[PDB]
C-alpha cells in the first residue's frame, strides 16, 4: 500500500555494471563505445544510449 508508481525497468541485476551498462536513468547507457568525433565535450552522451 502506498506504492505510488510501478515501472518495468531492464533488470539491473542481470545487466550489471560488469556489462558496462548503467540503468539509473531508465535507459541503458554505455560510456566510450560508439562515440561521435568532431563534437564538443558532453555531446557524446546521447550515443551512450
Amino acid at each position: 500500500y502506498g506504492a505510488a508508481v510501478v515501472n518495468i525497468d531492464l533488470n539491473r541485476d542481470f545487466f550489471d555494471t560488469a556489462t558496462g551498462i548503467d540503468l539509473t536513468k531508465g535507459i541503458p547507457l554505455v560510456q566510450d563505445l560508439l562515440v561521435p568525433i568532431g563534437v564538443t565535450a558532453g555531446a557524446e552522451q546521447s550515443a551512450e544510449y
Binding site: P36, I37, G38, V39, T40, A43
Partner: protein, 49 residues
C-alpha cells in the same frame, strides 16, 4: 554669373570653407561580435558554392 571653381584658375585663395566633424569620430565604442562555432565538424556543408 556662377562662381568659378578655385582649382580651375591660378590664383591663391587663403580663405576657404572646410567641412569638418564637430567632434572626434573615434568614440571608443568599437564593434564586437558573438562568433559561434559549428557544433560538429563532420556535419558542415562545404557543398553548393
Amino acid at each position: 554669373q556662377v562662381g568659378i571653381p578655385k582649382l580651375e584658375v591660378d590664383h591663391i585663395s587663403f580663405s576657404n570653407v572646410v567641412s569638418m566633424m564637430t567632434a572626434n569620430i573615434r568614440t571608443g565604442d568599437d564593434m564586437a561580435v558573438e562568433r559561434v562555432n559549428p557544433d560538429d565538424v563532420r556535419a558542415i556543408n562545404i557543398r553548393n558554392a
